[PDB]
Design a protein around this ligand. Structure first.
Ligand SMILES: CCCCCCCCCCCCCCCCCC(=O)OC[C@H](COP(=O)([O-])OCC(O)COP(=O)([O-])OC[C@@H](COC(=O)CCCCCCCCCCCCCCCCC)OC(=O)CCCCCCCCCCCCCCCCC)OC(=O)CCCCCCCCCCCCCCCCC
Ligand SMILES: CCCCCCCCCCCCCCCCC[C@@H](O)O[C@H](CO[C@H](O)CCCCCCCCCCCCCCC)COP(=O)(O)OCC[N+](C)(C)C
Ligand SMILES: CCCCCCCC/C=C\CCCCCCCC(=O)OC[C@H](COP(=O)(O)OCCN)OC(=O)CCCCCCC/C=C\CCCCCCCC
Ligand SMILES: CCCCCCCC/C=C\CCCCCCCC(=O)O[C@H](COC(=O)CCCCCCC/C=C/CCCCCCCC)COP(=O)(O)OCCN
Ligand SMILES: CCCCCCCCCCCC(=O)SCCNC(=O)CCNC(=O)[C@H](O)C(C)(C)COP(=O)(O)O
Lengths: 88, 128, 55, 84, 70, 124, 459, 104, 63, 219, 175, 178
C-alpha cells in the first residue's frame, strides 16, 4: 500500500476541486453546504454525473441507493469519510 | 431491432428484462409492501436478539433448523411408491450394478481365454 | 570423494533448514523473509558447481 | 517514516482545454449543438509531463543510440586490434 | 529501502536520475548485444549454407537414362 | 512446399511416397553404384555413446567436436571449425537425401512416360 | 499375551476405587502404560506367528490392530472428559467401565486362535457399544440408532454362528492354524454357495458393504464422541479382519462369488463419495467417508492378491487414525456451537488458527496425500485391482477425484470465509483438544517412516 | 446465490442470506462456491452451439492434417551398419540381411 | 560477519554430514551410487591402464 | 496426440489472450500458450529442445510477471489495462524491463527466447507432421506477437487514465535488483546455455530461405 | 571395499580418460574440487578415523544363522501335521530366498542401465537375459498362488504344469 | 449498503440506474478519455431527447427497448472497481476482520499490555450496557402496531440517549484492519 493517510481536509478539498472543474457550476456560488437540486439548479442526471465523477476520482464505487440520497458536498464528504474510516 | 436473449435453466432471465417487472399492477404493489413487511419484521427480530449485551450464545434460527430437518429427517414419511419413484429407483439403483457387472465379466472372460490359449505375453508380470 | 553427489544433495538439504527453524524465535520476528531469501541465494550459488562439473 | 508532509493541490484555474484533443471533441459536439461539462476535468491528463507521447516503435528503440555507439566503437577496436 | 518521494496530484511524478540511467543503460546493453551478435554471427538468422535447386541437377548424376535403355 | 501441393492436388502416383522410398533398385540408374564410407568404427562410437540418432555417416566430425568441447572447457567459444565441419557434413547428407528424393521422382516420371508410350503403341 | 489382558482387567478395580476427582488422571496414565506394553507385539516374524499359548496367538495382521486398540483408550478418555463433567461420579465410573470392557473384548477378539472364541468376543463387543450409544447420547433418535446397530449386526452374524458350527462338524476343528494347514477346495454347489454366503455376509454388514450400510450414519451421528471414535476407528475393522481370516477356507468359490460384492463396493464407493458432496451435517459426511474407504477395503479383500492384503491392512490402520481425528475435530466444534451443522459456524480459521492447521492435516491425510500411509493403502489396492481387470481404474480414479473434492469442501466450508456474526461464544482451544489432535496425528506421520509394521503378514 | 443483491446489508454477507427467510431446498448447491445460474451476456444455446462447433471443427481438421501430412523432399535418413542393428535390439548371433547404402 | 557465521552453520555443517553419510554409509552398500561411465574418445589416455586409444581413420579433410 | 493437443492448446489460449483486459490474465494465457508450444515440441520428437525452451521461458515469463506486479502495486492495486495510461516515462525501469521481456518472448533474434523458440519452429517446419498443427503453431506465433503488442500499447503509450492521486514510485533497491537480475538472465543466458551444453540434436543445417525466416516474418 | 562381494555385483574396470586440456586458460572445476577436498574431505576423514579407532578399541562379533534341511511337502504324509508344518516353514524360507535372488538380479539390471548411459540398449543385453531367465523361473514357481499361498498349492501348480508338459511331450514324440 | 431498501423502484430510479450502467459500460467500451467524453455527451443528449415526456405508457415502452439495447451491447467484461462486488480485491481483507468480542478472551498476561485501551473498552461496554436498556424501550414505544413496515431505524430523541441498536454499527472492525 504505502498510501498516505488522507484526512477530512483532503476529502473536502478534493470534493470542492472536482465540483469546481464542473463548468456548469460557478465556483463562487458553490460552497460546502450548497445543495444540488435547489441552490445549484442541477438536474437529477447531472447529480448522477457528479456521483460518477466522485467514483472515478476516489477509486471506489458508491451503491446507487446510497448515491441517489447524496445531495450536498458535505453529505458526500461524510459518506466517503464513513466508508474509508477517517479520524480527523 | 436486436437479436434476442433466450433464457435457460443455468442462464436465468435478468430482472431488467423480466416483462412482468415492467408491467406494475395495483395488486402487485400491495404484495410488494407485504413482502418487505415480513422481511423487515424478521430483520427487527434478528437485530433485537443480535444487539443484546446479555446474550452470549448463538441466535437459534428456525429457518435453518427447518431446512436441515426437511433435508434429512422428513424424507421417508412423505415417500410414496409411485411409478416415477419406482422406475427411477430401479434404474439408478440396479442398472449401474449390472452394467458394471457386464463390463467386468466381459473383460475377465476375454482375459482368461487369452491366458488359456497362451497368447497374452505376461512376461515380467511378477507382482500381482 | 566425487563432490558431485555431496553438493547435489546438500543444496536440497539446506533448502529445508528454514522450515526446521520455522518454530524458532527468528520466525516470530521480521528477519524471517531475509533469512529465507539468503538461504535460497546460498542454495543457488552452491548448486551452480554441479552444473559446471557436468558442462 | 511515511509520506506525511501536507501535500498541496494545484489551482483549479490551471486546467485549460487549450492544446489538448478535447478541442476536437468540443468542436464536434458544438457542430451538433452540445457541450462536455467535464472536459476541463480530464485536462490534467494532457497538461504536464503527460503532454509528450512516444510511438510504439519509438518505445521499442529505448536505447538504440547508446547501443549503436557502443557497437561501432567495439567494431573499430576489434578492427584495429585484429589487423596487427 | 529507497528514498522519500511524495505524491504529486495530477502532474508527472518525481523521478530520480538513478533509475533513468539504469533503464537507459539496460536498453543500451540489450541493443548492443543484438548488433554484436548479428555482426559476429549472422548465420543464425540468415543461414550460412545454400539451398540446392533440385531442377538444376542434371540427369547424369540422378541415374536417368534417355527413355529407351532400361 | 510446392511438392506437397503437387502431390495432394496433382496425380497421386506421379510423385513418390516418402514412406515407401525408395521404390526402385539402386542399380537402376547406372551399374557403378559406389558405396558410402563411414569413418567411425563401432567401438569408438559406442565408447563415445553419442546417441542412437546421431550415429549417422557424419559421426566422426561429431566425435571431434565432443573431444574439442571436453578438452577446451572453460571457454565455450574455443572451437567453431569442428562444428562447421560437422554442420557441412550434415548438409551434405541432407543434399544426398534430396538427390535421392528427386531421383525417385524423375525415375517415376520416366516409368510413367515409358508405360504411357508403350500403351499408346499397343493402341495403334 | 496375558501381560496385556490382565492389566486392562485390573483397570476396573482401579477406576472404581479411585477418588471422585482422580478417575480421569489414573485411567489416562495407566491406559498409556498398557499401550506402551502392548507395543511389544509389533516385533513379528516372516514365519507363521508368535504363539503365546493354545488360546491366544498374534500375527503381523493382529499386531497393528491390537496396538491401535490399546492406543485409542487414552484419547477416548480425553475426548469424553468434557461433556461428562456434570455427571455423577458413579455414572462417570460406569462410562469408564464400558470403555475398558470394550478395549478388553477387542483385545481378546484380535488374538482368538479359534473361530468360535473370536465369534463370541466379536459379538460381545455389541453390548458396551450399544449401551454407550443409547445411554450417553444427546438427541431423541439415539434409541432408534441403537436398535439398528444391534439388529443389522445380529442379522448378519446369526447365520455365521450356524455356519461355523457346521464346519466344526465336518472338518473337526476351527483352530486357525489347522484350518490353514488342512484347507480343502469348496466345489461349486448350492450348499457351498450358502456356506460361503453365511460365512462372508456376517462380516460384510460390519464393514459396512454398500446397501447394508444404513446403520452406520445413524450410529455414528447419534453416538457420543467416544462411541463415534471407537465405531469409526476399530469396530469397523472387525469385519475386514474377519474376512481376511475366513477367506482361507472359501477358495475357490470366492473367485465365482465375489462378483455381487465387488460390483456393490466398486459402485458403492462412487455413490457414497458423491453423497458426501451434498450433506448438511459434519458427522454424516465423515460417516459416509468411512463407508467409502471400507468399500475400497472390501474390494481389496475380495481381489485376493498379496498386494490386495497389504494395501487393505495399511488402509484399515490409516483410516482408523484419520476417522478418529476427524470425529474429534467435529466434536470440538459441536461443544462450542451445539448445532452439528456444517453451514452454521464458518470462518473459524481466523478465530482458532491451530484448530485450522489440525483440520488441514486431517483432511490432507483423508485426501490420501503422499507419502502418507493412506496413499500407500489406496495405491496398493488400486494396483491390485488394475492387475485384476484393467477397467477398475476409471471407478478408482473417479472415487479419488470425489474424495479430494468433498474433503476440501468439508475444510473450506468450516474453516474459510467470513465468520458468523451472531456467534460470540467461541473460546480459545484448550490444551486438551490440541493434545488430542496431536496424539491423533503424530503416529500417522511417524508410521509413514516404517510402513512394514502395518503392511500385514504378506509383506 | 450469486445473483442476489451484493450491496444489501445481509446478516451473512458471504452467504447472502437474511436471518429467518425460507432456505432454498438446494442451498448447498448454490453457495457462491458452486453452480451459479446468473444471466449471461450471450444466450446459453448460442454458447453451446459456438463451443461445440469450434470443438468439432478442430477435431475434423486435426484428422484432415493427419490424413494430409507435411514433409520435405527428402528420402529416409541412412544409417551405416545395417540400419544400426547391433546397438538397437542387438541379437548379435543372427547376421541380419545386409542392406547397403547408395552413394548419390 | 553475519554471512560468515551463516555459511558456517548452514552450508559447512550440512555438507559435512552429507559427505560423511555418502562416502562412508551410502557407498558401503553396493550399487547405491551408480555413475554413468565417462565418455571415451580416440587418442585419450586412461589413468588405470595407461593405454592410449587409437586415433581415427584419417577422413578426407576438405573445407 | 501430444502434438495435436499442444497445437490446439497454444492456438486457443493465445486467441483467448488476444482480447483480455486484466494484465495478469493476459500473461497467464501467455504462459499457457508457451506450455502448448512445449507440448508441440515434445510431439515432434525433440524433448531436449523443449527442455531448453523451459529454461528460457522461466527467465522471461517470471520477469514479465514481476513487472506486471510492480505496475499493479504502483497504481493502488489495479489490474485492468483500461486504467493504466502513459507509463513509459512515469516508471522507466518497469517499461524497459517489460519491453525486453516482450521482445524475448516474441523470439527477437539474439535474445533468450530466440535460441529456443526459433529452433522449435525450424524443427516443426521440416518434420513429417500434421498440416493443421503446423498452421496453428504459426498462427499462435503471430498471436503471441499481437498480444505482446497489446500489453505494451494499452499499458504504456497513451495518455494516463488512472485516478488523479498519483502514487507511482520505483525507488526501492529490492524491486530494482530483483528485476535487473532476471533482465541480465533474459539477455545473455540464452547464448550461455545454448553454447555451453553438448549438442543433443542433429542440427537443421539446410533450409529454404523463406522457411528459414518464417518466424521473423510471422512475428 | 571389502564390505560386500565383487562377484555378486560385478562392475566393469571403470576406465577414465586422463585430462588433456587444449586451452591455456585455467578452469574453475579443478580449483573447486581442491577447495572442496581440503574443506570437507579432510575434516570428514579425521572424524571417521577417530570413530574407527574408537570402534577398534571395542571389537566384538555377530554371526549369520544356519538352517538345516528338512523334508519338503513332497515327502509329507497326507494328515501328518508336524512334518507338514516343518515343510511349510522351509518352503517359506525358500520363497524369501527366491525373492532376494530376483532382487539381486534387478539391482544388477538397473545398475547396468545407469552406467552404460546412451548405449544401454546393446551393452546390457546379457543382464536382460539373466533377468528374463530368473523372472521366468520365479513366475512359474510362485505366481498365481493367491494371497493364501502355501506349500501344497505350489506343489499342486507344479504337478499340473508337469502333467501338461508330459502330455505335450508324449504327443510331440508320437506325431 | 448503509440505507434500507424501499418497497420498489419508481420509474425515475430505473431511469437513473439504466443511465449509470450505460455510462459505465460506455466508458469500458471507449478506453480513451476524449472518446468516452464524446460518446457520453452523445448518450446524454440521446437520453434527454425524451426527458420532458408526459405520458407513462410510452415512457415504460421506452426503458424497455433500452434494456434490450443495453443487454445486446453490454461488453461481457466490463471494468469493475477493485473493491467492488466484482473487483479483483473484493473481500481480500475479510480474513483480517476479527470480531471485537474476541478481545474478552485474552489472557490477563495479554491484557496487561495495552492497559489504556482496555480501560476505554470497559467504558464503552458500560455505556452500551445502559444504553441498551434505554434503546429497547425507545424501540418498543416508537414501533407502530403490527411490527415495522420498513427496515429503517429511528434516531435518538432525548439528551442522554443513543440511537437504538448502535453497538454493531459503530463497532465495525475496520476497512483495512490489517
Ligand atoms: C520436507 C521438508 C521439511 C523438513 C524439515 C522438518 C519439518 C518438521 C515437520 C514435523 C512434522 C509436522 C508436525 C505436524 C503438526 C505441526 C505442528 C504445527 O502446527 O506447526 C506450528 C509451527 C509454529 O508455527 P505457528 O506460529 O504456531 O502457526 C500456527 C498457525 O496454525 C499457522 O499454521 P501454518 O499456516 O503454518 O500451517 C502449518 C503448516 C505445517 O503444518 C502441517 O500441516 C504439518 C503436516 C504436513 C504433512 C501432512 C500429511 C501429508 C503426508 C506427509 C507425510 C510425510 C511425513 C514424513 C515423516 C514425518 C516425521 C514426523 O502447514 C503446511 O505447511 C502445509 C503442509 C503441506 C505439505 C505438502 C507436501 C508434504 C510432503 C512433501 C515431501 C515430504 C517427504 C519427502 C520425501 C523425499 C524428499 C526428501 O509451525 C511449524 O512448525 C511448521 C512445520 C514445518 C512444515 C512441515 C511441512 C512438511 C514436512 C512434513 C514432515 C517432515 C518431513 C521431514 C523431511 C526431512 C528430510
Ligand atoms: C537408548 C535407548 C534406545 C531404546 C529405548 C528402549 C525403551 C525401553 C522401554 C520401552 C519398551 C516397552 C516394553 C515392551 C516389552 C515389555 C513386555 C514384555 O515383552 O517384556 C517383559 C519384561 O520387560 C520389562 O521387565 C518391563 C518393561 C517396562 C518398560 C517401562 C520403561 C519406562 C517406565 C517409566 C515410568 C515413569 C516413572 C514414574 C513416574 C511418576 C516380559 O519379558 P520377560 O519374560 O520378563 O523376559 C524374558 C527374556 N528371557 C526369557 C530371555 C530371559
Ligand atoms: C470428468 C469430470 C466430471 C465432472 C466433475 C463433477 C464435479 C461436481 C462437483 C464440483 C464442485 C462444484 C464447484 O467446484 O463449483 C464450480 C466451480 C465454479 O466455477 P467457476 O467457473 O470457477 O466460477 C468462478 C466465477 N465466479 O467450477 C469448478 O471448479 C468445477 C469445474 C468442473 C469441470 C469439469 C469438466 C471438465 C471436463 C474435461 C474433459 C477433458 C478430459 C481430458 C482431456 C485430455 C485428454 C487427452
Ligand atoms: C443384514 C442382513 C444380512 C443377512 C445375513 C444372512 C444371509 C446369508 C445367506 C443365508 C444364511 C443361511 C445359510 C445357512 C447357513 C450355512 C449352513 C450350510 O452351509 O449348510 C448347508 C445347508 O444349506 C442350507 O441350509 C441353506 C438354507 C437357506 C435358508 C435361508 C435362506 C435365506 C435366503 C437366502 C437367499 C438370498 C441370498 C442373499 C441373502 C441376502 C440377505 C439380505 C449344507 O447343507 P447340508 O445338510 O450339509 O448338505 C449336505 C448333504 N447333501
Ligand atoms: C453501449 C451499450 C448499450 C447501451 C444503450 C443505452 C440505451 C440508450 C437509449 C436510451 C433511451 C431512453 O433514454 S428511454 C426514456 C425513458 N423515459 C424518460 O426518460 C422520460 C421520463 N424520465 C424522467 O422523468 C426522469 O425523471 C428524468 C427527467 C429523465 C430525470 O429525472 P430528474 O429530473 O429527477 O433528474
Amino acid at each position: 500500500s504505502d498510501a498516505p493517510p488522507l484526512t477530512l481536509e483532503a476529502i473536502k478539498d478534493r470534493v470542492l476541486y472536482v465540483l469546481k472543474l464542473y463548468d456548469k457550476i460557478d465556483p463562487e456560488k458553490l460552497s460546502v453546504n450548497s445543495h444540488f437540486m435547489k441552490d445549484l439548479g442541477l438536474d437529477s442526471l447531472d447529480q448522477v454525473e457528479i456521483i460518477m465523477a466522485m467514483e472515478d476520482e476516489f477509486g471506489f464505487e458508491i451503491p446507487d441507493i446510497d448515491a441517489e440520497k447524496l445531495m450536498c458536498p458535505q453529505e458526500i464528504v461524510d459518506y466517503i469519510a464513513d466508508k474509508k474510516d477517517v479520524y480527523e | 431491432s436486436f437479436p434476442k436473449y433466450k433464457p435457460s435453466r443455468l442462464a436465468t432471465l435478468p430482472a431488467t428484462l423480466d416483462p412482468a417487472e415492467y408491467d406494475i399492477s395495483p395488486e402487485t404493489r400491495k404484495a410488494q409492501a407485504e413482502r418487505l413487511a415480513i422481511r423487515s419484521r424478521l430483520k427487527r427480530e434478528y437485530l433485537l436478539q443480535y444487539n443484546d449485551p446479555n446474550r452470549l450464545g448463538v441466535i437459534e434460527d428456525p429457518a435453518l433448523i427447518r431446512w436441515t430437518y426437511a433435508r434429512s429427517a422428513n424424507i421417508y414419511p412423505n415417500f410414496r411408491p409411485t411409478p416415477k419413484t419406482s422406475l427411477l429407483g430401479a434404474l439408478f439403483g440396479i442398472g449401474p450394478l449390472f452394467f458394471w457387472y457386464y463390463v467386468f465379466k466381459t473383460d475377465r472372460d476375454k482375459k482368461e481365454k487369452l491366458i488359456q490359449e497362451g497368447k497374452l505375453d505376461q512376461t515380467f508380470n511378477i507382482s500381482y | 570423494m566425487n563432490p558431485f553427489a555431496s553438493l547435489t544433495l546438500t543444496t536440497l538439504t539446506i533448502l529445508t533448514i528454514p522450515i526446521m527453524m520455522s518454530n524458532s524465535n527468528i520466525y516470530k520476528t521480521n528477519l524471517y523473509p531475509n533469512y529465507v531469501k539468503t538461504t535460497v541465494s546460498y542454495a543457488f550459488t552452491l548448486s551452480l558447481v554441479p552444473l559446471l562439473m557436468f558442462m | 517514516e511515511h509520506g506525511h508532509s501536507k501535500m498541496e493541490l494545484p489551482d483549479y484555474k490551471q486546467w485549460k482545454i487549450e492544446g489538448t484533443p478535447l478541442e476536437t471533441v468540443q468542436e464536434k459536439l458544438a457542430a451538433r449543438g452540445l457541450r462536455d461539462p467535464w472536459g476541463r476535468n480530464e485536462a490534467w491528463r494532457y497538461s504536464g509531463g503527460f503532454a509528450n507521447n512516444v510511438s510504439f516503435v519509438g518505445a521499442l528503440l529505448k536505447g538504440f543510440k547508446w547501443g549503436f555507439a557502443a557497437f561501432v566503437v567495439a567494431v573499430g577496436a576489434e578492427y584495429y586490434l585484429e589487423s596487427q | 529501502g529507497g528514498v522519500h518521494i511524495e505524491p504529486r496530484y495530477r502532474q508527472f511524478p518525481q523521478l530520480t536520475r538513478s533509475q533513468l540511467i539504469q533503464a537507459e543503460f539496460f536498453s543500451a546493453t540489450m541493443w548492443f548485444w543484438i548488433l554484436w551478435r548479428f555482426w559476429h554471427d549472422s548465420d543464425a538468422v540468415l543461414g550460412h549454407f545454400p539451398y540446392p535447386d533440385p531442377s538444376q541437377w542434371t540427369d547424369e548424376e540422378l541415374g536417368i537414362l534417355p527413355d529407351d535403355e532400361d | 512446399g510446392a511438392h506437397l501441393a503437387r502431390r495432394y492436388l496433382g496425380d497421386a502416383s506421379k510423385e513418390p511416397d516418402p514412406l515407401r522410398m525408395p521404390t526402385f533398385p539402386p542399380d537402376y540408374g547406372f551399374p557403378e553404384r559406389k558405396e558410402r564410407e563411414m569413418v567411425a568404427t563401432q567401438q569408438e562410437m559406442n565408447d563415445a555413446q553419442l546417441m542412437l540418432q546421431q550415429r549417422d555417416y557424419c559421426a566422426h566430425y561429431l566425435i571431434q567436436l565432443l573431444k574439442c568441447k571436453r578438452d577446451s572447457f572453460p571457454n565455450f567459444l574455443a572451437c567453431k571449425h569442428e562444428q562447421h565441419d560437422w554442420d557441412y557434413c550434415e548438409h551434405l547428407d541432407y543434399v544426398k537425401r534430396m538427390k535421392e528424393f528427386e531421383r525417385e521422382r524423375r525415375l517415376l516420371q520416366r516409368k510413367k512416360r515409358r508405360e504411357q508410350r508403350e500403351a499408346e503403341m499397343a493402341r495403334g | 499375551m496375558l501381560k496385556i489382558i490382565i492389566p486392562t482387567t485390573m483397570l476396573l478395580p482401579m477406576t472404581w476405587m479411585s477418588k471422585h476427582n482422580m478417575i480421569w488422571i489414573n485411567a489416562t496414565v495407566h491406559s498409556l502404560l498398557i499401550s506402551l506394553i502392548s507395543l511389544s507385539l509389533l516385533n513379528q516374524l516372516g514365519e507363521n506367528s508368535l504363539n503365546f499359548s493354545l488360546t491366544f496367538f498374534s500375527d503381523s495382521l493382529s499386531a497393528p490392530l491390537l496396538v491401535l486398540t490399546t492406543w485409542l483408550l487414552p484419547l477416548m478418555l480425553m475426548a469424553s472428559q468434557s461433556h461428562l463433567s456434570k455427571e455423577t461420579t458413579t455414572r462417570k465410573k460406569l462410562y469408564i467401565t464400558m470403555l475398558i470392557l470394550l478395549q478388553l473384548f477387542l483385545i481378546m477378539t484380535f488374538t482368538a486362535t479359534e473361530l468360535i472364541l473370536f465369534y463370541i468376543l466379536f459379538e460381545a463387543t455389541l453390548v458396551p457399544t450399544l449401551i454407550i450409544i443409547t445411554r450417553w447420547g444427546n438427541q431423541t433418535e439415539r434409541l432408534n440408532a441403537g436398535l439398528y446397530f444391534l439388529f443389522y449386526t445380529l442379522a448378519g452374524s446369526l447365520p455365521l454362528l450356524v455356519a461355523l458350527v457346521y464346519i466344526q462338524n465336518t472338518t473337526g476343528s476351527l483352530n486357525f492354524l489347522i484350518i490353514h494347514y488342512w484347507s480343502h477346495p469348496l466345489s461349486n454347489s448350492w450348499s457351498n454357495i450358502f456356506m460361503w454366503l453365511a460365512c462372508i455376509m456376517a462380516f460384510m454388514v460390519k464393514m459396512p458393504l454398500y446397501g447394508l450400510h444404513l446403520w452406520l450414519p445413524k450410529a455414528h451421528v447419534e453416538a457420543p464422541i467416544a462411541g463415534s471414535m471407537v465405531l469409526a476407528a476399530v469396530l469397523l475393522k472387525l469385519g475386514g479382519y474377519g474376512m481376511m481370516r475366513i477367506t482361507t477356507i472359501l477358495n475357490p468359490l470366492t473367485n465365482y462369488m465375489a462378483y455381487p460384492f465387488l460390483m456393490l463396493s466398486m459402485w458403492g464407493m462412487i455413490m457414497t463419495s458423491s453423497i458426501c458432496l451434498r450433506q448438511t451435517d459434519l458427522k454424516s459426511l465423515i460417516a459416509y467417508s468411512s463407508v467409502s474407504h471400507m468399500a475400497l477395503v472390501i474390494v481389496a479383500i475380495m481381489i485376493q492378491t498379496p498386494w490386495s492384503f497389504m494395501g487393505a491392512t495399511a488402509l484399515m490402520i490409516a483410516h482408523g487414525l484419520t476417522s478418529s481425528m476427524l470425529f474429534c475435530l467435529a466434536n470440538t466444534n459441536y461443544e462450542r456451537v451445539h448445532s452439528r451443522t456444517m453451514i452454521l459456524a464458518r470462518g473459524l480459521q481466523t478465530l482458532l488458527p491451530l484448530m485450522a492447521t489440525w483440520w488441514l492435516v486431517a483432511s490432507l491425510t483423508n485426501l490420501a496425500l503422499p507419502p502418507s500411509i493412506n496413499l500407500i493403502g489406496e495405491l496398493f489396492i488400486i494396483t491390485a485391482s488394475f492387475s485384476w481387470s484393467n477397467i477398475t481404474i476409471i471407478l478408482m480414479g473417479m472415487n479419488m477425484m470425489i474424495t479430494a473434492l468433498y474433503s476440501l469442501y468439508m475444510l473450506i466450508t468450516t474453516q474459510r470465509g467470513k465468520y458468523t456474526h451472531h456467534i460470540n461464544n467461541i473460546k480459545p482451544s484448550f490444551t486438551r483438544e490440541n493434545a488430542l489432535m496431536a496424539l491423533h496425528i503424530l503416529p500417522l506421520l511417524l508410521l509413514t517412516l516404517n510402513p512394514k509394521m502395518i503392511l500385514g503378514p504378506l509383506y | 446465490q450469486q445473483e442476489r443483491d451484493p450491496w444489501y446489508d445481509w446478516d451473512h454477507p458471504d452467504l447472502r442470506l437474511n436471518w429467518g427467510e425460507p432456505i432454498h431446498w438446494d442451498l448447498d448447491m448454490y453457495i457462491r462456491n458452486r453452480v451459479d445460474t446468473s444471466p449471461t451476456p450471450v444466450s446459453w444455446n448460442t454458447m453451446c452451439k459456438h463451443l461445440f462447433g469450434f470443438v468439432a471443427f478442430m477435431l475434423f481438421m486435426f484428422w484432415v492434417g493427419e490424413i494430409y501430412p507435411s514433409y520435405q523432399p527428402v528420402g529416409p535418413k541412412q544409417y551405416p551398419y545395417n540400419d544400426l542393428y547391433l546397438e538397437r535390439g542387438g541379437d548379435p548371433t543372427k547376421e541380419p540381411e545386409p542392406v547397403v547404402h547408395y552413394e548419390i | 560477519y553475519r554471512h560468515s557465521i551463516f555459511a558456517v552453520t548452514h552450508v559447512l555443517i550440512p555438507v559435512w554430514i552429507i559427505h560423511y553419510y555418502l562416502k562412508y554409509h551410502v557407498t558401503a552398500k553396493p550399487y547405491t551410487v551408480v555413475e554413468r561411465k565417462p565418455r571415451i574418445f580416440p587418442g585419450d589416455t586412461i589413468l588405470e591402464t595407461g593405454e592410449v586409444i587409437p586415433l581415427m581413420k584419417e577422413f578426407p579433410d576438405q573445407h | 496426440m501430444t502434438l495435436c493437443l499442444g497445437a490446439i492448446t497454444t492456438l486457443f489460449t493465445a486467441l483467448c489472450a488476444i482480447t483480455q483486459n486484466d494484465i495478469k490474465k493476459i500473461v497467464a494465457f501467455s504462459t499457457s500458450s508457451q506450455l502448448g508450444l512445449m507440448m508441440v515440441t515434445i510431439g515432434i520428437n525433440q524433448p531436449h529442445l523443449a527442455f531448453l525452451h523451459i529454461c528460457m521461458h522461466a527467465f522471461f515469463k517470471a520477469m514479465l510477471f514481476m513487472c506486471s506486479g510492480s505496475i499493479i502495486h504502483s497504481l493502488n492495486d489495479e489490474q485492468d489495462i483500461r486504467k493504466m495510461g502513459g507509463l513509459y516515462k512515469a516508471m522507466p525501469f518497469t517499461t524497459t524491463a517489460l519491453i525486453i521481456g516482450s521482445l524475448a518472448l516474441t523470439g527477437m533474434p539474439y535474445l533468450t527466447g530466440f535460441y529456443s523458440k526459433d529452433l522449435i519452429i525450424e524443427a516443426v517446419n521440416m518434420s513429417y507432421t500434421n498440416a493443421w498443427a503446423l498452421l496453428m503453431t504459426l498462427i499462435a506465433t503471430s498471436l503471441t506477437a499481437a498480444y505482446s503488442t497489446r500489453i505494451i500499447f494499452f499499458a504504456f503509450l497513451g495518455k494516463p487514465r488512472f485516478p488523479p492521486l498519483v502514487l507511482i514510485n520505483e525507488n526501492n533497491p529490492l524491486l530494482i535488483n530483483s528485476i535487473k537480475r532476471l533482465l541480465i538472465g533474459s539477455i545473455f543466458a540464452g547464448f550461455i546455455i545454448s553454447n555451453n551444453i553438448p549438442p543433443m540434436t542433429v542440427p537443421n543445417t539446410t533450409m529454404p530461405l523463406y522457411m528459414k525466416m518464417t518466424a521473423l516474418i510471422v512475428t | 571395499p571389502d564390505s560386500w562381494d565383487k562377484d555378486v555385483y560385478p562392475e566393469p574396470p571403470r576406465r577414465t580418460p586422463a585430462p588433456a586440456p587444449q586451452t591455456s586458460l585455467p578452469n574453475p572445476v579443478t580449483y573447486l574440487t581442491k577447495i572442496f577436498d581440503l574443506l570437507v574431505d579432510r575434516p570428514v576423514t579425521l572424524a571417521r578415523e577417530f570413530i574407527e579407532q574408537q570402534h577398534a578399541k571395542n571389537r566384538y562379533y555377530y554371526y549369520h544363522r544356519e538352517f538345516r534341511r528338512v523334508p519338503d511337502i513332497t515327502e509329507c504324509e497326507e494328515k501328518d501335521i508336524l512334518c507338514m508344518f516343518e515343510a511349510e516353514m522351509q518352503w517359506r524360507r525358500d520363497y524369501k530366498v527366491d525373492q532376494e535372488i530376483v532382487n539381486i538380479i534387478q539391482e544388477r539390471l538397473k545398475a547396468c542401465q545407469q552406467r552404460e548411459g546412451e548405449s544401454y540398449r546393446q551393452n546390457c543385453a546379457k543382464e536382460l537375459e539373466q533377468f528374463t531367465q530368473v523372472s521366468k523361473a520365479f513366475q512359474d514357481r510362485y505366481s498365481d498362488l493367491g494371497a493364501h499361498y502355501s506349500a501344497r498349492k505350489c506343489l499342486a501348480k507344479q504337478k499340473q504344469r508337469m502333467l501338461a508338459e508330459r502330455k505335450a511331450a508324449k504327443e510331440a514324440a508320437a506325431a | 449498503a448503509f440505507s434500507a431498501p424501499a418497497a420498489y423502484l419508481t420509474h425515475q430510479q430505473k431511469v437513473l440506474r439504466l443511465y449509470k450502467r450505460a455510462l459505465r459500460h460506455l466508458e469500458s467500451w471507449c478506453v480513451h478519455r476524449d472518446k468516452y467524453r464524446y460518446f457520453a455527451c452523445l448518450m446524454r443528449a440521446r437520453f434527454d431527447e425524451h426527458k420532458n415526456e408526459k405520458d407513462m405508457v410510452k415512457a415504460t415502452q421506452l426503458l424497455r427497448q433500452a434494456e434490450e439495447e443495453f443487454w445486446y451491447g453490454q461488453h461481457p467484461q466490463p471494468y469493475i472497481f477493485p473493491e467492488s462486488p466484482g473487483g479483483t480485491s473484493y473481500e481480500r481483507y475479510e480474513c483480517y476482520k476479527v470480531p471485537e468480542w474476541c478481545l474478552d478472551d485474552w489472557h490477563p498476561s495479554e491484557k496487561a499490555m495495552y492497559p489504556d485501551y482496555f480501560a476505554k473498552r470497559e467504558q464503552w461496554k458500560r455505556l452500551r450496557r445502559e444504553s441498551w436498556e434505554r434503546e429497547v424501550k425507545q424501540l418498543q414505544e416508537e414501533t407502530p402496531p403490527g411490527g415495522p413496515r420498513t427496515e429503517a431505524l429511528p434516531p435518538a430523541r432525548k439528551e442522554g440517549d443513543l440511537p437504538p441498536l448502535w453497538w454493531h454499527i459503530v463497532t465495525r472492525p475496520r476497512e483495512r484492519p490489517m
